[PDB]
What does this fold into?
Amino acid sequence: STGSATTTPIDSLDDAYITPVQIGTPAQTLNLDFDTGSSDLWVFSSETTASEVDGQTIYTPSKSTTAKLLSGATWSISYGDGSSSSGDVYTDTVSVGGLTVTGQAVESAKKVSSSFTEDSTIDGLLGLAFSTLNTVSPTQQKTFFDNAKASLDSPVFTADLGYHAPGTYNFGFIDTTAYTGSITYTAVSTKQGFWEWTSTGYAVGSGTFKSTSIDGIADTGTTLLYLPATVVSAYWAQVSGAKSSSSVGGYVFPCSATLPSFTFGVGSARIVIPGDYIDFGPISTGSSSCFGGIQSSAGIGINIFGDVALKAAFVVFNGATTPTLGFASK
It folds into this structure.
């Protein structure tokens, strides 16, 4: 089997992408944030505290003839950005782009943190990291991909995120028309539960490529590119007037600037992020200070190849017995 679904930016900055997901019978379609940096499929629901729902579409398990309470199971997650959610668990039928999994754990939120409530466009998350990170207790649950894997034509999914435009998540096949050149594959460590890999270096604009190992994770659920402070300083030094602002929370730059590209290495291959992808617009409405899309990871503990990086590539998440990642230009 295969599946193919379009993923759409939630706003004009590409802050996140939403993909429609059918849950239950009859289907309830919710728009979920596919997140290769986490491993829970959780949704706003009829159980979510009413004051914490503000415009999201909810899953109502009592209206699904295939829903079953997973008795005793609870979940609670905290994300790298400080947001969180928790609740109980149902199993139900879940379909993405025509690919159906029966008995998928659907984690129903009883509580969500304010950042989720305040984002009316995201009805939940669909985690695509390794199932070892799933938070369901006392019986850890598998991700949608883990459950689908055996049925898929090939045990892979691909992320093809758009710049200011829709893109595609495919399951079970690699669309050879969706990229240019060849796909370069690179080793993955699953020791932390992430799609963790080592980039071979970087370049700023037309500058020389610096060969250096940068361990990080491929994370579709993170907006920006978070890299070591040395790398980030080298990038922003090429933008007149750019500076790190402690009050804003990262590097800002004059909105009148033209940003240089940023290249990262995948083996001997190179992925070029155009400068425009690194512009996240005014820090507040009407400001002439703009927020940068490349930021320091120094306070995170891990480097994160988020959407800024991934949207410059066609990315293969190869879930074979020994997982690997593939990157192609497009």
